Write an enzyme that holds these catalytic residues in place. Structure first.
Site, PDB file in Angstrom:
ATOM      1  CB  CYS A  88      -0.994   0.366   1.323  1.00 13.86           C
ATOM      2  SG  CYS A  88      -1.863   1.273   0.809  1.00 13.86           S
ATOM      3  NE  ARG A 143       2.282   0.622   2.816  1.00 14.37           N
ATOM      4  CZ  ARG A 143       3.993   0.201   3.348  1.00 14.37           C
ATOM      5  NH1 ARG A 143       4.119  -0.530   5.321  1.00 14.37           N
ATOM      6  NH2 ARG A 143       4.383  -0.720   2.672  1.00 14.37           N
ATOM      7  CD1 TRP A 201      -7.051   9.251  -1.580  1.00 16.39           C
ATOM      8  CD2 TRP A 201      -8.619   9.480   0.270  1.00 16.39           C
ATOM      9  NE1 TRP A 201      -6.192   9.469  -0.602  1.00 16.39           N
ATOM     10  CE2 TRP A 201      -6.745   9.806   0.456  1.00 16.39           C
ATOM     11  CE3 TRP A 201      -9.403   9.760   1.080  1.00 16.39           C
ATOM     12  CZ2 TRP A 201      -6.392  10.459   1.389  1.00 16.39           C
ATOM     13  CZ3 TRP A 201      -7.887   9.453   2.754  1.00 16.39           C
ATOM     14  CH2 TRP A 201      -7.048  10.476   2.616  1.00 16.39           C
ATOM     15  CD  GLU A 251      -5.924   2.338  -6.206  1.00 16.06           C
ATOM     16  OE1 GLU A 251      -6.692   1.399  -5.821  1.00 16.06           O
ATOM     17  OE2 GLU A 251      -6.026   3.197  -5.927  1.00 16.06           O
TER      18      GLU A 251
HETATM   19  C1  HEM Z   1      -6.099   6.100   2.211  1.00 15.86           C
HETATM   20  C2  HEM Z   1      -6.278   6.332   0.434  1.00 15.86           C
HETATM   21  C3  HEM Z   1      -4.954   5.041   0.068  1.00 15.86           C
HETATM   22  C4  HEM Z   1      -4.019   5.354  -0.867  1.00 15.86           C
HETATM   23  C5  HEM Z   1      -4.193   6.390  -2.157  1.00 15.86           C
HETATM   24  C6  HEM Z   1      -3.524   3.739  -1.118  1.00 15.86           C
HETATM   25  C7  HEM Z   1      -3.441   3.073  -2.364  1.00 15.86           C
HETATM   26  C8  HEM Z   1      -2.766   1.803  -2.637  1.00 15.86           C
HETATM   27  C9  HEM Z   1      -2.665   1.107  -3.585  1.00 15.86           C
HETATM   28  C10 HEM Z   1      -2.347   1.530  -5.007  1.00 15.86           C
HETATM   29  C11 HEM Z   1      -2.810   0.099  -3.533  1.00 15.86           C
HETATM   30  C12 HEM Z   1      -2.216  -1.051  -4.743  1.00 15.86           C
HETATM   31  C13 HEM Z   1      -3.948  -1.193  -5.496  1.00 15.86           C
HETATM   32  C14 HEM Z   1      -3.910  -1.531  -6.337  1.00 15.86           C
HETATM   33  O1  HEM Z   1      -2.988  -1.931  -7.342  1.00 15.86           O
HETATM   34  O2  HEM Z   1      -4.240  -2.914  -5.981  1.00 15.86           O
HETATM   35  C15 HEM Z   1      -3.000  -0.720  -2.261  1.00 15.86           C
HETATM   36  C16 HEM Z   1      -2.432  -1.671  -2.137  1.00 15.86           C
HETATM   37  C17 HEM Z   1      -3.326  -1.668  -0.614  1.00 15.86           C
HETATM   38  N1  HEM Z   1      -3.697  -0.826   0.317  1.00 15.86           N
HETATM   39 FE1  HEM Z   1      -3.986   1.314   0.230  1.00 15.86          FE
HETATM   40  N2  HEM Z   1      -4.394   2.977  -0.110  1.00 15.86           N
HETATM   41  C18 HEM Z   1      -5.124   3.354   1.059  1.00 15.86           C
HETATM   42  C19 HEM Z   1      -5.847   3.325   1.967  1.00 15.86           C
HETATM   43  C20 HEM Z   1      -6.147   1.857   2.317  1.00 15.86           C
HETATM   44  C21 HEM Z   1      -6.633   1.654   3.225  1.00 15.86           C
HETATM   45  C22 HEM Z   1      -7.418   2.270   4.534  1.00 15.86           C
HETATM   46  C23 HEM Z   1      -6.129   0.548   3.770  1.00 15.86           C
HETATM   47  C24 HEM Z   1      -6.779  -0.532   5.148  1.00 15.86           C
HETATM   48  C25 HEM Z   1      -6.943  -0.016   5.735  1.00 15.86           C
HETATM   49  C26 HEM Z   1      -5.027  -0.117   2.760  1.00 15.86           C
HETATM   50  C27 HEM Z   1      -4.865  -1.144   3.119  1.00 15.86           C
HETATM   51  C28 HEM Z   1      -3.906  -1.661   1.357  1.00 15.86           C
HETATM   52  C29 HEM Z   1      -3.597  -3.275   1.535  1.00 15.86           C
HETATM   53  C30 HEM Z   1      -3.696  -4.145   2.250  1.00 15.86           C
HETATM   54  C31 HEM Z   1      -2.872  -3.377  -0.004  1.00 15.86           C
HETATM   55  C32 HEM Z   1      -2.650  -4.370  -0.820  1.00 15.86           C
HETATM   56  C33 HEM Z   1      -4.134  -4.847  -1.927  1.00 15.86           C
HETATM   57  C34 HEM Z   1      -3.980  -6.681  -2.141  1.00 15.86           C
HETATM   58  O3  HEM Z   1      -2.358  -6.829  -1.899  1.00 15.86           O
HETATM   59  O4  HEM Z   1      -4.438  -6.649  -2.539  1.00 15.86           O
HETATM   60  N3  HEM Z   1      -4.723   0.806   1.838  1.00 15.86           N
HETATM   61  N4  HEM Z   1      -3.282   1.186  -1.710  1.00 15.86           N
HETATM   62  F1  LIG Z   2      -6.855 -11.386  -9.908  1.00 17.45           F
HETATM   63  C1  LIG Z   2      -6.329 -10.206  -9.151  1.00 17.45           C
HETATM   64  C2  LIG Z   2      -6.197 -11.026  -8.271  1.00 17.45           C
HETATM   65  C3  LIG Z   2      -5.104 -11.325  -6.351  1.00 17.45           C
HETATM   66  C4  LIG Z   2      -4.717  -9.353  -6.559  1.00 17.45           C
HETATM   67  C5  LIG Z   2      -5.423  -8.619  -7.385  1.00 17.45           C
HETATM   68  C6  LIG Z   2      -5.389  -7.294  -7.820  1.00 17.45           C
HETATM   69  C7  LIG Z   2      -5.406  -6.570  -6.284  1.00 17.45           C
HETATM   70  C8  LIG Z   2      -6.731  -5.507  -6.654  1.00 17.45           C
HETATM   71  N1  LIG Z   2      -7.717  -5.568  -5.010  1.00 17.45           N
HETATM   72  C9  LIG Z   2      -6.554  -3.982  -4.760  1.00 17.45           C
HETATM   73  C10 LIG Z   2      -7.784  -2.766  -4.689  1.00 17.45           C
HETATM   74  C11 LIG Z   2      -8.354  -2.414  -4.918  1.00 17.45           C
HETATM   75  C12 LIG Z   2      -9.029  -1.005  -4.923  1.00 17.45           C
HETATM   76  N2  LIG Z   2      -8.844  -1.095  -4.325  1.00 17.45           N
HETATM   77  C13 LIG Z   2      -7.941  -0.388  -3.130  1.00 17.45           C
HETATM   78  N3  LIG Z   2      -7.463  -0.392  -2.160  1.00 17.45           N
HETATM   79  C14 LIG Z   2      -8.156   0.174  -1.680  1.00 17.45           C
HETATM   80  C15 LIG Z   2      -6.954   0.857  -0.486  1.00 17.45           C
HETATM   81  N4  LIG Z   2      -6.103  -0.217  -0.890  1.00 17.45           N
HETATM   82  C16 LIG Z   2      -5.912  -0.643  -1.750  1.00 17.45           C
HETATM   83  N5  LIG Z   2      -7.006  -2.313  -3.577  1.00 17.45           N
HETATM   84  C17 LIG Z   2      -5.851  -8.885  -9.261  1.00 17.45           C
END
Ligand code: HEM
Ligand SMILES: Fc1cccc(CCCNCc2ccnc(-n3ccnc3)n2)c1
Ligand code: HEM
Ligand SMILES: Fc1cccc(CCCNCc2ccnc(-n3ccnc3)n2)c1
Ligand SMILES: C[C@H](O)[C@H](O)[C@H]1CNc2nc(N)[nH]c(=O)c2N1
Ligand SMILES: C[C@H](O)[C@H](O)[C@H]1CNc2nc(N)[nH]c(=O)c2N1
Ligand SMILES: [Zn+2]
Lengths: 407, 411
Positions: free
Chosen positions: B108, B111, B280, B285
């Site tokens: 993420c 963070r 947000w 994305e």
């Molecule tokens: C505040 C605005 C936030 C932004 C801009 C942000 C941005 C991102 C982005 C760009 C990714 C990669 C997304 C993707 O490619 O699928 C990501 C992944 C992630 N974010 Fe965020 N995030 C935010 C808030 C949060 C929050 C509130 C949480 C949990 C409380 C969180 C936990 C994660 C986690 C666990 C991932 C990994 C997702 C995965 O392995 O599929 N994020 N974040």
């Molecule tokens: F086909 C797949 C199998 C496992 C992971 C995948 C990509 C993760 C996509 N979800 C990440 C995702 C989407 C929207 N929002 C957030 N998000 C919001 C805050 N932090 C992350 N993250 C594709």
């Protein structure tokens, strides 16, 4: 032990078994991945030799043959008495090609088997090194139709008699730090340039001055030579739409040629082993031109394009970046010099990966380095899982000689 | 053991001691790096160590380590495990827990915001209708009329793993996909499978390109149930371009609230299998992945056509050219409608500042370079040039199998 890699864009799944022959270590553990760190004796030598000869003879379908055993026999006799040994031409050629097949950071390996190897193991002086280099340069450049090449200087012996090319590439622009505070030319080479000067170069203090070679034979203090200017093919950088682009004053050289690496073949270390192929566009347009600590030209270019530079969210950097890169490809192609774009090149490497999966059972690959530094997710390699491991023969990094060299 | 990371653009060297508290595996060995691989019912036995571990951190963070209050809490959780076999988190611990799982999430980029997270405790929830109601409140509170607020909602923990709360959607808000008999897809190809499940479960699909999917909710191990989010709660943004007027006529929109609904939150050995969180969007994305992956809306073709780019040879870079425009359009649409969004330059810069801060205060910041580096313009963002250490801390978010692969149907 039998690992899978999935393409998330095509669902193609491949089984990697080649990794099981991983010789060297990665930097990683189960507790910590180091995937993004730029750089993490008679007894020793015979096993390395054996492992290499074994693959060699396997490759020519003579594994376990009288000829195979005799060669092992022979190399073994040679280490025992002489404490080193010499590669047969054929083995040297196969060593070099496989060092390249094995480079997990090289997107260009679909080409691995057409490497032209030049054996310079008879070289004894820096003047000879200079001569071998010029021929490599001219052969590889080939008037713009570039061809892959490596030139291999004598192997290390007791480490007091190393061959080394002090330049990191055969061809690179100099860098000079001003009283004014800033940097003229390539900030990447500022230090090397000073060594050229403290060793005696007559620098013309310009923005694009081809550096002189600093060559070291047989452990000797290195010596300077200029590359015949007429052997250094360069391209003036124009844009096919913006007429004002030419005024930016930009050129790049056609021949990318890495010269500071160490080639390891069946236990032996060739510490001067310059190699060259040809550019993927982004290497220059994205990295050389636009890296903040390189020529860093984004702000100047954005201005000429008249973009809203007030806020990052206009994506003006992104716009400029694209144009700069179009202008690189365009200029090379117009001047008829070999260049590949990141789309075509990453797509080749995917064809290559499957080949290698199919024929070798794998292909070590470093995702951090294979994904281009622009438009990542729109090139196929972005969606491709890759396993990275270290096979031999290999190219390895080695300390810069001004830290090791006893004068 | 100290570990150093280097920034190749600025030459800052940092020192990581945090990785020393890492417990979980990475999937790498000395002989293989799995850094680009997408993916890698608990006894008393294991549980107390994990609990103790967590509560020492909790108590450290509040500067109460070794306090009578600290001891008694260990005492209490202890007895509770061996008598009931699990235990219950205090409110404050659940909060701290949720926060730290975000802070530890190495993929993420967002963070820097980890300490402003609104945690909703739905641990009293017992039915699917109760889940729906909880989720609606979450959507509405997080959306905040476009001024988005981070939040997470936490449903009850796993017990015997026969009674799980799951949200079957992968995101609270997402668009239907429908494979057609001719082989094409209408809407989002990423959600075709889930879409078919919804249909099978009784949803009447409008079958358009941007149909918001029904929530599909499982409570207490029960078969799950369909609900429609009230459209009035679903904030959406039409996509137009500041200079190209034909852009609107492509018909694009996207929803404003990115909300991950399919992960597992682990805190002191406790597993929360339903824990939707939302922040947000970073512009990319949507502009890069959702619109431009070939496996997604796949619009590069149509956009480049309208800009009438030379598409006959890829070395025109027409793909890269359309791509910038689409992303400009997304950032512009969102900003114009006063809906929170962040561009990749701004997001990665903030992340570098966060990461440095983390090294100074915490002694580390695990980061996944493959994921942190944006999917366009990698090297003109300062993260590209940043060496990162990736390793697993708890509390954390984990992946879990899709529930239709595992669920025992009741009937
Ligand atoms: C505040 C605005 C936030 C932004 C801009 C942000 C941005 C991102 C982005 C760009 C990714 C990669 C997304 C993707 O490619 O699928 C990501 C992944 C992630 N974010 Fe965020 N995030 C935010 C808030 C949060 C929050 C509130 C949480 C949990 C409380 C969180 C936990 C994660 C986690 C666990 C991932 C990994 C997702 C995965 O392995 O599929 N994020 N974040
Ligand atoms: F086909 C797949 C199998 C496992 C992971 C995948 C990509 C993760 C996509 N979800 C990440 C995702 C989407 C929207 N929002 C957030 N998000 C919001 C805050 N932090 C992350 N993250 C594709
Ligand atoms: C034929 C055209 C070639 C292309 C298009 C190509 C492409 C590339 C690219 C883009 C990189 C990353 C380098 C960077 O970002 O600095 C790379 C690295 C590398 N290539 Fe090539 N390459 C080619 C030929 C060769 C040849 C002929 C060899 C050796 C015989 C070679 C061995 C390597 C090695 C070892 C690296 C990693 C260098 C490092 O770690 O700094 N390549 N290649
Ligand atoms: F500052 C640094 C320390 C160690 C490695 C680094 C990156 C290597 C950059 N040189 C790789 C390079 C350059 C030109 N040409 C090639 N090349 C040509 C064909 N294949 C690779 N490769 C920077
Ligand atoms: C820190 C990170 O390892 C470093 O910036 C890498 C990232 N990926 C790269 N990829 C390529 N092809 N070349 C590079 O020099 C780098 N630099
Ligand atoms: C195979 C590879 O790991 C996969 O494409 C990853 C690469 N980096 C990513 N980075 C982000 N932020 N999101 C993703 O889905 C991916 N996908
Ligand atoms: Zn690793």
């Amino acid at each position: 032990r039998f690992l899978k890699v999935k393409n998330w864009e095509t669902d193609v799944v491949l089984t990697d078994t080649l990794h099981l022959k991983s010789t060297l270590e990665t930097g990683c553990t189960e507790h910590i991945c180091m995937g993004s760190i730029m750089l993490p004796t008679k007894d020793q030598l015979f096993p390395l030799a054996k492992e290499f000869l074994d693959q060699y003879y396997s490759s020519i379908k003579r594994f376990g043959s009288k000829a195979h055993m005799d060669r092992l026999e022979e190399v073994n006799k040679e280490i025992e008495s002489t404490s080193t040994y010499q590669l047969k031409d054929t083995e040297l050629i196969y060593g070099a090609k496989h060092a390249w097949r094995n480079a997990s950071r090289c997107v260009g390996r679909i080409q691995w088997s057409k490497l032209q190897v030049f054996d310079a193991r008879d070289c004894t002086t820096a003047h000879g090194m200079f001569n071998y280099i010029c021929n490599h340069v001219k052969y590889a450049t080939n008037k713009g139709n570039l061809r892959s090449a490596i030139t291999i200087f004598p192997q290390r012996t007791d480490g007091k008699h190393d061959f080394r090319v002090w330049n990191s590439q055969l061809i690179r622009y100099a860098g000079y730090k001003q009283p004014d505070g800033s940097t003229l030319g390539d900030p990447a080479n500022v230090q090397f340039t000073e060594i050229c000067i403290q060793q005696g170069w007559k620098a013309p203090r310009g923005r694009f001055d081809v550096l002189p070679l600093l060559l070291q034979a047989n452990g000797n203090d290195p010596e300077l030579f200029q590359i015949p200017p007429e052997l250094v093919l360069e391209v003036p950088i124009r844009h096919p739409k913006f007429d004002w682009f030419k005024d930016l004053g930009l050129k790049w050289y056609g021949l990318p040629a890495v010269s500071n690496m160490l080639l390891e073949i069946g236990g032996l270390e060739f510490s001067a082993c310059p190699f060259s192929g040809w550019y993927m566009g982004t290497e220059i347009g994205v990295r050389d031109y636009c890296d903040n600590s390189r020529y860093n030209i984004l702000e100047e270019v954005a201005k000429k394009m008249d973009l809203d530079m007030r806020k990052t969210s206009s994506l003006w950097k992104d716009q400029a970046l694209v144009e700069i890169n179009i202008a690189v490809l365009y200029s090379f192609q117009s001047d008829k010099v070999t260049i590949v774009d990141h789309h075509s090149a990453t797509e080749s490497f995917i064809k290559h990966m499957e080949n290698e999966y199919r024929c070798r059972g794998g292909c070590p690959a470093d995702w951090v380095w294979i994904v281009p530094p622009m438009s990542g997710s729109i090139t196929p390699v972005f969606h491709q899982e890759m396993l990275n491991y270290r096979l031999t023969p290999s190219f390895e990094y080695q300390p810069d000689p001004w830290n090791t060299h006893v004068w």
